[PDB]
Amino acid sequence: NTASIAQARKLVEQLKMEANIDRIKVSKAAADLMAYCEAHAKEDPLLTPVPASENPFR
């Protein structure tokens, strides 16, 4: 019916929109994750154990 053709057009224009997502090297994302995990490490009281003085669950 008309609904089937409408869904076909919708998926066509969705897939066409999927064809341009300015694909970039994944190594940049890995380097960004590296920098974020390295710089933002001191203020995480889960990986680095914290003394009981600065702990509110004592």
Partner 1 sequence: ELDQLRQEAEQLKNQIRDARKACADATLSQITNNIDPVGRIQMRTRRTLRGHLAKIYAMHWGTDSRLLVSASQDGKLIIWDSYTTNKVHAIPLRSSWVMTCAYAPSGNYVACGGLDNICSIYNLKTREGNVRVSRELAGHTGYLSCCRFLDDNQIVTSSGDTTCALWDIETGQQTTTFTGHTGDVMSLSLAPDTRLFVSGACDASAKLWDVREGMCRQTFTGHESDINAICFFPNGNAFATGSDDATCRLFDLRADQELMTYSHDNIICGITSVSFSKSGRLLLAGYDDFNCNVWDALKADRAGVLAGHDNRVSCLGVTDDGMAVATGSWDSFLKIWN
| Chain-centroid distance, C-alpha 13 | 25
> Interface with partner 1 includes 43 (CB under 8 A)?
yes
> Interface with partner 1 includes 56 (CB under 8 A)?
yes
The CA-based angle 17-18-20, given to 5 degrees, is 80
* Residue 54 in tokens: 């600065």
> Interface with partner 1 includes 6 (CB under 8 A)?
no
| Chain contacts with partner 1 (rule: CB under 8 A) | 4, 8, 10-12, 14-15, 17-19, 21, 23-27, 29-30, 32-34, 36-37, 40-41, 43-47, 50, 55-57
